[PDB]
Design a binder for this molecule. Structure first.
Ligand SMILES: CC(C)(C)OC(=O)COCCOCCOCCOCCNC(=O)COc1ccc(N2CCN(CCn3ncc4c3nc(N)n3nc(-c5ccco5)nc43)CC2)cc1
Ligand SMILES: CC(C)CCC[C@@H](C)[C@H]1CC[C@H]2[C@@H]3CC=C4C[C@@H](O)CC[C@]4(C)[C@H]3CC[C@]12C
Ligand SMILES: CC(C)CCC[C@@H](C)[C@H]1CC[C@H]2[C@@H]3CC=C4C[C@@H](O)CC[C@]4(C)[C@H]3CC[C@]12C
Ligand SMILES: CC(C)CCC[C@@H](C)[C@H]1CC[C@H]2[C@@H]3CC=C4C[C@@H](O)CC[C@]4(C)[C@H]3CC[C@]12C
Ligand SMILES: CCCCCCCC/C=C/CCCCCCCC(=O)OC[C@H](O)CO
Ligand SMILES: CCCCCCCC/C=C\CCCCCCCC(=O)OC[C@H](O)CO
Ligand SMILES: CCCCCCCC/C=C\CCCCCCCC(=O)OC[C@H](O)CO
Ligand SMILES: CCCCCCCC/C=C\CCCCCCCC(=O)O
Ligand SMILES: CCCCCCCC/C=C\CCCCCCCC(=O)O
Ligand SMILES: CCCCCCCC/C=C\CCCCCCCC(=O)O
Ligand SMILES: CCCCCCCC/C=C\CCCCCCCC(=O)O
Ligand SMILES: CCCCCCCC/C=C\CCCCCCCC(=O)O
Ligand SMILES: CCCCCCCC/C=C\CCCCCCCC(=O)O
Ligand SMILES: CCCCCCCC/C=C\CCCCCCCC(=O)O
Ligand SMILES: CCCCCCCC/C=C\CCCCCCCC(=O)O
Ligand SMILES: CCCCCCCC/C=C\CCCCCCCC(=O)O
Ligand SMILES: CCCCCCCC/C=C\CCCCCCCC(=O)O
Ligand SMILES: CCCCCCCC/C=C\CCCCCCCC(=O)O
Ligand SMILES: CCCCCCCC/C=C\CCCCCCCC(=O)O
Ligand SMILES: CCCCCCCC/C=C\CCCCCCCC(=O)O
Ligand SMILES: CCCCCCCC/C=C\CCCCCCCC(=O)O
Ligand SMILES: CCCCCCCC/C=C\CCCCCCCC(=O)O
Ligand SMILES: CCCCCCCC/C=C\CCCCCCCC(=O)O
Ligand SMILES: CCCCCCCC/C=C\CCCCCCCC(=O)O
Ligand SMILES: CCCCCCCC/C=C\CCCCCCCC(=O)O
Ligand SMILES: CCCCCCCC/C=C\CCCCCCCC(=O)O
Ligand SMILES: CCCCCCCC/C=C\CCCCCCCC(=O)O
Ligand SMILES: CCCCCCCC/C=C\CCCCCCCC(=O)O
Length: 390
């Protein structure tokens, strides 16, 4: 007395095909953009490309697999396992790519001087290839023996008339829910997501601390100038100049144009320090006044450029954090439903329509990343226009 299953099946299959088309087109555009623009050919975008390659595979393979397993067709149980678990391989690869992007950005903001020598393209390719191997091993673990193939639903397999060694290919009949909850969700998805949260929190903490240190050195420069102009004793000028020389060397610790600026600044401070040690107070004050011209024509240019670079790193890290957040938004509902199915056997199973709504939502994650790049990364957006208009 239920509606014919092909009616709801047609809606589900049509929606899945719409998602596969959008996932392929958008992520092919991302890969094409990185190929054409050398400004997008950095190590960070090598993981973005691996991220896009997995989403392309979601539309090409994982979504046709999901359509197949929804029919419950008779199949050899290990072949049904591969059909059911291959999306876990792709998803695990994206988790590894997302974690590497956060680590790459944390390295770029914590030690930017050592970044290009530490994070190279060759090492990135090796990391990516290793993570794909681990993704296959993690996602296909049920094929190694952790499955319900040894406990088949004989009622379903007889009613559908499956042959010997065959089962009705249904996800929750062949894939153990304890694998899905403890192994896949808790260990392989939830824990890495929490690690990404901690890395991005450390990224924003590092940026906030460095931006405050730039303003601290800047105000230390201007406040000690007022101390010298209103000083009366020679030691007052000397103590204020010693603290400027520390804040000057600690601020540097066309790139030589900024190095030449601190050379003038420290040189003038040493000039005023020599006069202050001699007892000359008026001549030491006038020498310290020369620091203002160096501050305007040099030191202020470094502050605003160093501040601009840090603000770009904050904005870029926020964009990459949105991608992690949308990943969790798309996949957590399916994981949470499996937790209810596993941990509350007295709860009624989530209805059929909610199951496939959660499945469809997890697939839409393969569509959203190209939109994040187009809206939040100007280099991607301008390359997208160039590809499309020509
Ligand atoms: C034509 O079709 C012929 C077939 O014949 C079937 C006969 O009718 C079945 C409907 O129920 C009848 C009443 N019986 C009852 O017992 C009543 O209560 C219910 C209700 C609904 C259900 N669900 C119905 C929907 N299924 C969808 C199968 N599926 N596909 C992919 C994934 C998945 N499931 C889970 N968990 N994940 N997790 C992940 C994942 C990845 C990363 C993290 O998580 N990916 C999946 C699940 C079970 C169960 C019991
Ligand atoms: C390079 C790409 C495009 C190749 C695609 C490979 C896919 C389409 C192939 C490889 C292994 C194949 C599975 C191997 C096991 C059999 C078991 C059988 O009872 C039903 C079909 C099933 C489940 C096959 C489904 C399709 C399958 C998953
Ligand atoms: C992570 C963000 C998007 C929030 C996730 C909300 C979803 C995953 C939660 C909120 C309410 C939850 C439902 C509340 C009612 C129960 C009834 C029980 O018999 C089956 C599970 C079911 C149906 C839960 C399924 C998962 C659920 C729908
Ligand atoms: C990403 C953050 C939010 C952590 C992930 C949320 C998960 C771990 C939490 C949120 C809601 C929790 C569920 C809330 C309802 C209870 C019902 C109980 O009978 C079994 C445990 C169960 C089903 C919990 C299982 C674990 C659970 C699904
Ligand atoms: C089975 C599911 C869980 C398994 C998880 C525990 C496995 C233990 C450690 C494995 C080492 C990593 C193996 C992957 C490396 C593949 C080789 C490769 O390609 O490495 C190229 C590298 O750039 C230069 O060799
Ligand atoms: C059809 C294949 C059969 C199955 C496909 C599996 C996933 C595809 C794996 C592709 C991995 C892409 C990795 C990548 O592109 O990283 C290079 C990076 O750009 C450095 O230059
Ligand atoms: C690249 C395209 C991918 C297609 C998904 C693979 C689809 C898997 C096809 C399974 C069909 C099958 O085996 O059906 C047997 C049925 O039980 C007897 O009528
Ligand atoms: C919503 C779509 C319902 C599709 C119903 C499937 C039967 C189609 C065959 C027919 O149109 O005669
Ligand atoms: C985000 C986009 C969400 C798309 C929502 C559109 C409808 C989604 C799923 C339809 C639910 C009906 C599926 C019927 C069960 C499949 C079956 O009968 O085997
Ligand atoms: C989009 C292409 C049309 C998809 C319709 C699926 C119907 C196939 C079926 O379930 O019988
Ligand atoms: C099947 C996948 C076909 C698309 C793969 C090639 C696109 C990547 C690219 O444009 O550089
Ligand atoms: C199905 C297989 C999906 C293929 C996915 C991506 C193709 C390989 C990666 C695309 C080109 C990467 C090189 C580059 O962008 O610089
Ligand atoms: C670029 C290629 C992308 C994939 C092309 C193939 C498109 C076909 C999509 C899914 C087909 C699913 C077949 C359904 C299996 C039905 C099982 C049964 O007969 O009982
Ligand atoms: C290009 C692909 C176009 C549409 C393919 C739709 C295939 C229909 C799947 C039917 C599943 C079933 O056997 O019930
Ligand atoms: C690229 C090559 C990838 C495809 C390789 C071959 C897939 C064919 C395996 C299907 C086995 C069917 C099992 C059975 O007959 O019951
Ligand atoms: C490229 C990687 C291609 C797929 C790896 C093959 C996974 C098959 C595992 C063996 C399970 C089995 O044969 O029963
Ligand atoms: C192009 C990729 C080349 C590698 C292809 C290797 C085989 C992939 C399909 C076989 C894995 C599915 C295992 C299920 C089974 O064999 O019974
Ligand atoms: C198989 C060996 C794994 C260790 C090498 C891989 C490097 C770390 C990989 C991910 C672990 C989680 C990292 C958590 C934050 C690390 C960033 C940091 O502390 O600087
Ligand atoms: C530049 C780097 C490009 C990386 C391409 C991706 C390579 C992925 C290769 C296939 C790994 C499959 C082998 C895993 C075996 C264990 C899975 C299993 O059979 O259980
Ligand atoms: C994140 C990591 C969370 C790890 C698991 C905490 C709860 C473990 C479940 C206890 C077993 C309950 C039971 O099934 O009897
Ligand atoms: C990476 C390592 C993270 C592992 C995370 C926790 C896994 C969940 C542990 C729960 C134990 C379940 C035991 C039980 O079933 O009673
Ligand atoms: C693993 C991290 C769990 C999430 C809590 C964030 C940790 C931030 C680290 C820090 O601020 O020092
Ligand atoms: C549990 C949730 C988070 C724990 C608190 C994270 C630490 C806050 C930032 C620490 C700091 O300011 O150094
Ligand atoms: C888990 C929480 C999911 C939150 C992710 C939402 C991203 C918001 C970014 C934005 O669009 O402004
Ligand atoms: C669950 C962990 C998700 C970590 C990142 C999501 C929140 C950050 C954000 O919305 O930008
Ligand atoms: C779009 C929002 C979709 C549904 C969100 C809440 C789902 C709760 C389902 C309750 C039905 C039930 O358990 O019987
Ligand atoms: C609906 C699936 C995706 C959920 C959030 C949509 C984000 C769209 C966007 O940020 O451009
Ligand atoms: C079915 C696919 C559902 C939507 C996924 C795409 C999310 C972003 C699309 C809206 C953004 C925009 O208005 O340009």
């Amino acid at each position: 007395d239920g509606a014919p299953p092909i009616m709801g099946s047609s809606v589900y299959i049509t929606v899945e095909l719409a998602i596969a088309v959008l996932a392929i087109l958008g992520n092919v555009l991302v890969c094409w953009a990185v190929w054409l623009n050398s400004n997008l050919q950095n190590v960070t975008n090598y993981f973005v490309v691996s991220l896009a390659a997995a989403d392309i595979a979601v539309g090409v393979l994982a979504i046709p697999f999901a359509i197949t397993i929804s029919t419950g067709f008779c199949a050899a149980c290990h072949g049904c396992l591969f059909i059911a678990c291959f999306v876990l391989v792709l998803t695990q690869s994206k988790i590894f790519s997302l974690l590497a992007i956060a680590i790459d950005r944390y390295i770029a903001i914590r030690i930017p001087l050592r970044y290009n020598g530490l994070v190279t393209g060759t090492r990135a390719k090796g990391i990516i290839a290793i993570c794909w191997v681990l993704s296959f091993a993690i996602g296909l673990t049920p094929m190694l023996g952790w499955n319900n193939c040894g406990q088949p639903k004989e009622g379903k397999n007889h009613s559908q008339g499956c042959g010997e060694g065959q089962v009705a290919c249904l996800f929750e009949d062949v894939v153990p829910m304890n694998y899905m909850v403890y192994f896949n969700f808790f260990a392989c998805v939830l824990v890495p997501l929490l690690l990404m949260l901690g890395v991005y929190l450390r990224i924003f903490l590092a940026a906030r601390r460095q931006l405050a240190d730039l303003e601290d050195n800047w105000e230390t420069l201007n406040d000690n100038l007022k101390v010298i102009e209103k000083a009366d004793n020679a030691a007052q000028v000397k103590d204020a100049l010693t603290k400027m020389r520390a804040a000057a060397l600690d601020a540097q610790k066309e790139m030589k144009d900024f190095r030449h600026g601190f050379d003038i600044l420290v040189g003038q401070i040493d000039d005023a320090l020599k006069l202050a040690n001699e007892g000359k107070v008026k001549e030491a004050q006038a020498a310290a006044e020369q620091l203002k011209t160096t501050r305007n024509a040099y030191i202020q240019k470094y502050l605003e450029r160093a501040r601009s670079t840090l603000q770009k790193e904050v904005h870029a890290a926020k964009s990459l954090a949105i991608i992690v957040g949308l990943f969790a938004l798309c996949w957590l509902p399916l994981h949470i439903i499996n937790c209810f199915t596993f941990f509350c056997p007295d709860c009624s199973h989530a209805p059929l329509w909610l199951m496939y709504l959660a499945i469809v939502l997890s697939h839409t994650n393969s569509v959203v990343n190209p939109f994040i790049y187009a809206y939040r990364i100007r280099e991607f957006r301008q390359t997208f226009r160039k590809i499309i208009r020509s």
